[PDB]
Amino acid sequence: FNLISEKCDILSILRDHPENRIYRRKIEELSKRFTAIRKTKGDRNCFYRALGYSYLESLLGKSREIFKFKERVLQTPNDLLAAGFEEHKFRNFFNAFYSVVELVEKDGSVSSLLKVFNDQSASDHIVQFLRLLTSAFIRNRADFFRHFIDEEMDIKDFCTHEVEPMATECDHIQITALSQALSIALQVEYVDEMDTALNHHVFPEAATPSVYLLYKTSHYNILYA
Ligand SMILES: *CC(=O)/N=C/c1cccc(C)c1
User: Fold this and answer.
1) Residue 41 CA: which ligand 1 atom is closest?
2) Which conformational region is residue 198 in: left (phi greater than 0), alpha (psi within -120 to 50 degrees), or beta?
3) Is 46 a residue of the active site?
4) Which cysteines in this chain are paired by disulphide bridges?
5) Which residues neighbour 5 within 8 Å (Cβ) at sequence distance 6 or greater?
6) Which domains are seen in the chain, by residue range?
7) Between the chain's N and C termini, which has fewer beta carbons within 10 Å?
């Protein structure tokens, strides 16, 4: 469990910030709203790895939701081709993601899903797929991302440098794009060391979330309501 941990009590993370007044205050407050947490490895891939695991875990046992998600995943090669990716170069990453979705369907256990996401090979193939799909979704909607995020940004250079490569950190744009690319509603809780309110953002703004993440010390951990 070196990439994604077993479930722990929320208050177990006090030990990560000993004798810290603001972090203790915010973690106590978080414990009033959430019951458990899983930690992720801080290797620069933790957003993709956390969102992929938590969303697929939320599908377990839900036969209609699995059928609809599989139908969307089967169309994602068309998003990659429209953005200029070549089939022979994405094949191994697409096949790894489709495999873990079939595991959710066929096996249906937390234990089997957690083993794939802790297998360095399978887990990194899944992360690389999710990074290629994020890049494709932004590229194919460049005018949207310029209109609503930043009129001045260079979209192709940003995807090349800050989305595709393994270990590159995320900002709001990658979070919004992968949410939209896979129709995943997620809520991010923010815990920093400023004397401010514990607060959160929902992607998309509308939505009822499937996934809750904690963003703290540049790391995304998984929360349970
Ligand atoms: C999500 C992820 O992998 N974060 C890695 C990280 C942690 C701590 C400090 C930095 C810059 C990164």
Assistant:
1) 3
2) beta
3) yes
4) none
5) 38, 39, 40
6) 1-40+185-225 (3.30.200.60), 41-184 (1.20.1300.20)
7) C
190 DSSP β-pair partners:
199, 215
The rounded Å distance from CA 219 to ligand 1 centre is 5
Q: Solved by what technique?
A: X-ray
| Lateral strand order in the sheet of 199-203 | 8-9, 36-38, 219-224, 211-216, 186-190, 199-203
Using CA positions, which residue lies closest to atom 12 of ligand 1? 218
Angstrom distances, CA of residue 218 to CA of 13, 95, 114, 134: 15, 30, 23, 20
Atom of ligand 1 nearest to the CA of 43: 3
Q: Which of 216, 219, 221 to mutate to test the pocket of ligand 1 (most atoms within 8 A of CB)?
A: 219
170 catalytic per annotation: no
Question: Does the beta carbon of 47 sit less than 6 angstroms from any atom of ligand 1?
Answer: yes
Task: Tell me which residue has tokens 């309501």.
Answer: 225
- Alpha helix (H) residue ranges in the chain: 21-30, 46-59, 63-82, 87-106, 110-118, 120-140, 142-148, 155-162, 172-182
Question: Is 207:24 a contact under the CB 8 Å cutoff?
Answer: no
Which residue has 């360095």 as its token pair? 120
User: Known catalytic residue: 219?
Assistant: yes
Beta bridge partners of 213: 188, 222
